[PDB]
Design an enzyme around this catalytic site. Structure first.
Site, PDB file in Angstrom:
ATOM      1  N   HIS A 159      96.732  46.268 -13.039  1.00 41.33           N
ATOM      2  CA  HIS A 159      96.146  44.946 -13.252  1.00 41.33           C
ATOM      3  C   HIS A 159      97.154  43.981 -13.879  1.00 41.33           C
ATOM      4  O   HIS A 159      97.338  42.846 -13.409  1.00 41.33           O
ATOM      5  CB  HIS A 159      94.905  45.157 -14.122  1.00 41.33           C
ATOM      6  N   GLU A 202      96.411  44.836   7.698  1.00 39.81           N
ATOM      7  CA  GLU A 202      97.664  45.578   7.733  1.00 39.81           C
ATOM      8  C   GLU A 202      98.251  45.842   6.350  1.00 39.81           C
ATOM      9  O   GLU A 202      99.468  46.025   6.233  1.00 39.81           O
ATOM     10  CB  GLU A 202      98.692  44.863   8.619  1.00 39.81           C
ATOM     11  N   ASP A 216      94.322  47.941  -8.369  1.00 39.89           N
ATOM     12  CA  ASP A 216      93.541  46.755  -8.691  1.00 39.89           C
ATOM     13  C   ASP A 216      93.918  45.646  -7.724  1.00 39.89           C
ATOM     14  O   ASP A 216      95.104  45.367  -7.529  1.00 39.89           O
ATOM     15  CB  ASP A 216      93.767  46.299 -10.135  1.00 39.89           C
ATOM     16  N   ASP A 226      88.667  49.795  -8.952  1.00 40.46           N
ATOM     17  CA  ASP A 226      88.070  48.751  -9.770  1.00 40.46           C
ATOM     18  C   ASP A 226      88.486  47.412  -9.177  1.00 40.46           C
ATOM     19  O   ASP A 226      89.503  47.320  -8.487  1.00 40.46           O
ATOM     20  CB  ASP A 226      88.486  48.918 -11.253  1.00 40.46           C
TER      21      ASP A 226
END
Length: 351
Positions: free
Chosen positions: A326, A212, A174, A244
């Site tokens: 997340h 990078e 995420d 996502d």
RNA sequence: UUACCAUCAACAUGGAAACUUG
RNA sequence: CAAGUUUCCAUGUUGAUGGUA
């Protein structure tokens, strides 16, 4: 769906149980003794009730719970905590957890405590707020959830699931675009270490531009594969990526640019070319289909992997392996802004 | 920053158009 | 070529309100 020790776990109707549940065991229960508990001056007998209730009924978890190392705080000042909150490594150095009840919901207290509990002294810990748990008649469920959080946080686990697809490691990530300053774009990463998705390896990636990041991604992935070979000795064969955090506008410039030299990490060593799956989540559409199998068997796989949130047992919006990264992203890319420590990346210390 | 389920206030970026300056 | 006065909103985050718990 959900399993346990010596029995399977309960599968209810709308899969939310919540009200005084887990009246049974867990996967691992190491006996917790040296969990030095800090209570403040303003919640003395409340913390006494907390310890007395933690020892008594919370369901037969199997947690061999014992009286902790009780610490009493003078006040909630900055100088009061900052004298010795390195999660108490001053004298002995052989600790597991430090449990704190805090009254002032000042976020810098979290920031300092979690920073010197993650990088300056890598230790998993759980904090307690008085204003949500300070009353009885609801103490059962919050005591149960504190015990389950300790269960996940001691390197132990709550449950697992069966997998019909052989040797599967669950890759999830995420992005956290910083809305305030700097535009960090922190991307987490999760992967399974064990066969039954019980031990999890989770890295955090730190890079300023959008170019990078890939080198640190490849370094983390070859480290994860080396750790997988160390812990399993039979190499994983199925790779599914749950992407996502990217809308329809960023989909063309990410799903056709990032993932080929993310795939190019497999040239660090020889004799390896497994099957690749990369999805999108917003609703599920694939963007890389190399496994070449039916959509139903893997949609059922994703619906199963949605169900293993190890702090909230029940239904959630997007797949769970998105959310282990997340919550790690707002743990690190929002609050900490530091590189993760080596040992706890094999645990879910973000929860 | 608990254990998520909603709501609103405070804010950060983008769309849709009148006044008006360099 | 853009800065503003901006009116609607949308996308997200922080607190608080009610809770299940």
């Amino acid at each position: 769906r959900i399993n346990l020790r010596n029995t399977s776990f309960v599968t209810s109707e709308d899969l939310n149980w919540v009200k005084e549940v887990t009246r049974d065991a867990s996967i691992l229960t190491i006996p917790m003794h040296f969990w030095a508990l800090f209570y403040p001056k303003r919640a003395m007998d409340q913390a006494r009730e907390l310890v007395n209730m933690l020892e008594k009924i919370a369901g037969p978890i199997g947690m061999r719970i014992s009286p902790p190392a009780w610490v009493e705080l003078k006040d909630d000042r900055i100088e009061t905590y900052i004298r010795t909150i390195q999660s108490l490594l001053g004298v002995e150095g052989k600790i597991q957890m430090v449990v704190c009840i805090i009254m002032g919901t000042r976020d810098d207290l979290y920031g300092a405590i979690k920073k010197l509990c993650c990088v300056q002294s890598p230790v998993p810990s759980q904090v307690i707020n008085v204003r949500t748990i300070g009353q009885p008649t609801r103490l059962r469920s919050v005591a149960q959830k504190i015990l389950l959080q300790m269960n996940c946080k001691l390197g132990g686990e709550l449950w697992g699931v069966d997998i019909p697809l052989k040797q599967l490691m669950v890759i999830g990530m995420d992005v956290y675009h910083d809305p305030s300053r700097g535009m960090r774009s922190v991307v987490g990463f999760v992967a399974s270490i064990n066969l039954t998705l019980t031990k999890w390896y989770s890295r955090v990636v730190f890079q300023m531009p959008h170019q990078e990041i890939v080198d640190s991604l490849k370094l983390c992935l070859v480290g994860s594969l080396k750790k997988y070979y160390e812990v399993n000795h039979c190499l994983p064969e199925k790779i599914v990526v749950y992407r996502d955090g990217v809308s329809d506008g960023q989909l063309k410039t990410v799903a056709n640019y990032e993932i080929p030299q993310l795939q190019k990490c497999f040239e660090a060593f020889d004799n390896y070319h497994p099957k690749m799956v990369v999805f999108v989540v917003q609703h599920y559409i694939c963007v890389l289909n190399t496994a070449n199998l039916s959509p139903d068997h893997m949609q059922r796989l994703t619906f199963k992997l949605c169900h293993m949130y190890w702090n909230w047992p029940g239904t959630i919006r997007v797949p769970a392996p998105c959310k282990y990264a997340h919550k790690l992203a707002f743990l690190s890319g929002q609050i900490l802004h530091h590189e993760p420590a080596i040992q706890l990346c094999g645990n879910l210390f973000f929860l």
